[PDB]
Design an enzyme around this catalytic site. Structure first.
Site, PDB file in Angstrom:
ATOM      1  CG  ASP A   1      51.756 -35.722  41.557  1.00 24.90           C
ATOM      2  OD1 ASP A   1      50.894 -36.595  41.786  1.00 24.90           O
ATOM      3  OD2 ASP A   1      52.905 -36.006  41.155  1.00 24.90           O
TER       4      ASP A   1
ATOM      5  CD  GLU B   1      56.933 -40.061  46.152  1.00 21.06           C
ATOM      6  OE1 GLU B   1      56.539 -40.332  44.995  1.00 21.06           O
ATOM      7  OE2 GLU B   1      57.703 -40.801  46.795  1.00 21.06           O
TER       8      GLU B   1
ATOM      9  CG  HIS C   1      51.882 -39.799  43.146  1.00 19.74           C
ATOM     10  ND1 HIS C   1      52.546 -38.651  42.748  1.00 19.74           N
ATOM     11  CD2 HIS C   1      52.819 -40.587  43.715  1.00 19.74           C
ATOM     12  CE1 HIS C   1      53.825 -38.749  43.072  1.00 19.74           C
ATOM     13  NE2 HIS C   1      54.011 -39.916  43.659  1.00 19.74           N
TER      14      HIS C   1
ATOM     15  CD  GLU D   1      56.561 -46.952  44.946  1.00 23.10           C
ATOM     16  OE1 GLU D   1      56.877 -47.854  44.147  1.00 23.10           O
ATOM     17  OE2 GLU D   1      56.357 -45.774  44.576  1.00 23.10           O
TER      18      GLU D   1
ATOM     19  CG  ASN E   1      57.123 -42.550  50.686  1.00 25.10           C
ATOM     20  OD1 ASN E   1      56.355 -41.761  51.225  1.00 25.10           O
ATOM     21  ND2 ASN E   1      57.479 -42.440  49.406  1.00 25.10           N
TER      22      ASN E   1
END
Length: 302
Positions: A240, A238, A210, A132, A173
């Site tokens: 979801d 990641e 996400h 990030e 990432n």
């Protein structure tokens, strides 16, 4: 555990894995969770144990109990491991954030990367070296690393990682790289192009993914856009999705499936109650650790 392993089915398409996350608690809270991980997933990312706050709480004092456990569980059960994460502005000890001297922060940064990577040398498939580092508009986030060292911290981190463990894929990432044309996606692509041209060892770009409900159909384009950065590979790190609809999940799986650079997908959690956004039921297994419709849908799409 689901009878059909989506990891097995994904690997059958030439992908490296379809994984999830874990750490001591979720791996031991019940029987079904570790059983699901062993039966249906082929890769593991430590949920919190490898982060800076959990590994070097005090300058030069390392605490590897949690990370050791996750690595040992993965290695003991044939699961690939994505180390997560070496350099990040969040979950970073105050002692690091207060450093104002450039050479001092570089020394600290290199020691952190070296010690953590050396401990698991040869056992890590990929490392989220940087996490990030971009603002939503695509510019570099003004973290302590950027403020004190400047942009050169990118080169320093990747070069150190490469020299410590040449067997690991080095990743940058980030989240919100979910639709082609988004400012952050453009920023990720432009910067990586420049860094790669400068010889910085960036092997992959990780897209957290996400998502909210209905955002699955835009991921394919995002991955295509990210492919233009020029890294050898990319990965959904990641995943979801609020609501966990079969349409959203299958769209995301297909997004990776139909993109040559996408080596795999890591779903951020196994069952809903263990999700960081549990109220949105964003995972593939429910409150009873049983497969949801989306899990079966993914299986049937492969």
């Amino acid at each position: 555990q689901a009878s059909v392993s989506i990891d097995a089915k994904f690997k059958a398409h030439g992908k490296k894995y379809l994984g999830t996350i874990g750490d001591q608690y979720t791996l031991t809270k019940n029987t079904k969770n570790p059983a699901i991980i062993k039966a249906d997933f082929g890769q593991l990312t430590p949920e919190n144990s490898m982060k800076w706050d959990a590994t070097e709480p005090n300058r030069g004092q390392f605490t590897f109990s949690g990370s050791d456990y996750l690595v040992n569980f993965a290695q003991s059960n044939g699961k690939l491991i994505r180390g997560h994460t070496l350099v990040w502005h969040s979950q970073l000890p105050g002692w690091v954030s207060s450093i104002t001297d450039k050479n001092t922060l570089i020394s600290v940064l290199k020691n952190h990367i070296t010690t953590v990577m050396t401990r698991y040398k040869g056992k890590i498939y990929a490392w989220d070296v940087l996490n990030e580092i971009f603002n939503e508009d695509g510019s570099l986030r003004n973290s302590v690393f950027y403020n004190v060292i400047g942009e050169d911290y990118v080169r320093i981190a990747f070069e150190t990682a490469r020299s410590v463990d040449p067997n690991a894929k080095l990743y940058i990432n980030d989240y919100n790289l979910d639709s082609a044309g988004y400012s952050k996606v453009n920023g990720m692509v432009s910067h990586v192009k420049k860094w790669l041209a400068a010889g910085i060892p960036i092997d992959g770009i990780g897209s957290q993914t996400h998502l909210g409900a209905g955002a699955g159909s835009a991921v394919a384009g995002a991955l295509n856009a990210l492919a233009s950065a020029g890294t050898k590979e990319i990965a959904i790190t990641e995943l979801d999705i609020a609501g966990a609809s079969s349409t959203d999940y299958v769209n995301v799986v297909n997004a990776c499936l139909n993109q040559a650079k996408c080596v795999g997908i890591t779903v951020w959690g196994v069952a809903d109650p263990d999700s960081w956004r549990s109220s949105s039921s964003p995972l593939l297994f429910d409150g009873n650790y049983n497969p949801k419709a989306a899990y079966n849908a993914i299986a049937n799409a492969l």
